[PDB]
Amino acid sequence: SFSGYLKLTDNVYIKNADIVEEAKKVKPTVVVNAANVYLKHGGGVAGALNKATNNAMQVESDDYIATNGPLKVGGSCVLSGHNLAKHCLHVVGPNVNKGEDIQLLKSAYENFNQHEVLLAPLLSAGIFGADPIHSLRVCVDTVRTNVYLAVFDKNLYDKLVSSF
Numbered sequence: 001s002f003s004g005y006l007k008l009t010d011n012v013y014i015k016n017a018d019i020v021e022e023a024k025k026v027k028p029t030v031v032v033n034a035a036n037v038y039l040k041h042g043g044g045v046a047g048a049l050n051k052a053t054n055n056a057m058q059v060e061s062d063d064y065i066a067t068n069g070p071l072k073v074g075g076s077c078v079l080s081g082h083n084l085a086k087h088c089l090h091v092v093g094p095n096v097n098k099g100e101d102i103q104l105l106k107s108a109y110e111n112f113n114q115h116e117v118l119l120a121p122l123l124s125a126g127i128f129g130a131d132p133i134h135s136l137r138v139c140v141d142t143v144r145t146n147v148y149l150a151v152f153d154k155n156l157y158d159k160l161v162s163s164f
């Protein structure tokens with residue numbers, strides 16, 4: 001089970017951890033990937049998760065896109081979790097650095113409500129350009145299922161907890 005998490009609300013927990021190492025240790029039912037609409041896992045959390053799967057996540061993702069076309073910003077798909085989890089929920093938050101609408105962040109977090117418990121990063125944070133404090137606020141105000149947030153950056157983790 002999940003261990004070492006601080007409790008923020010009735011259903012949201014948080015830890016300063018590398019989500020790849022956390023997924024390998026816990027092997028959760030669902031790990032969330034911070035995806036783009038093309039499922040091109042080059043960098044950020046997506047690049048790190050994909051590298052941990054030895055590129056099997058990218059091979060599966062390219063077959064999914066060839067069949068179905070791109071996801072919508074705010075949308076998601078369920079694929080295999082490979083060696084990290086039973087399933088991977090690929091969720092597309094808006095990328096502010098690409099000029100996407102931050103209002104779609106709530107729609108992105110609504111995908112989490114389809115799963116009873118998830119290991120997840122903060123959506124639209126990091127290289128997606130949104131304020132992580134805002135992303136945590138939208139997460140707590142949207143997700144009703146049990147979410148275990150992994151924040152890689154120690155200094156950001158301390159700021160998120162102290163300003164919550």
Ligand SMILES: CO[C@]1(C(=O)O)CCN(C(=O)c2ncnc3[nH]ccc23)C1
Pocket residue numbers: 018019020034043044045048121122125126127132150151152153156
């Ligand atoms: C909330 O801000 C971030 C964090 O500290 O968790 C900043 C970075 N973020 C990531 O998900 C991330 N970005 C690049 N490489 C990574 N390797 C593993 C995770 C990851 C989100």
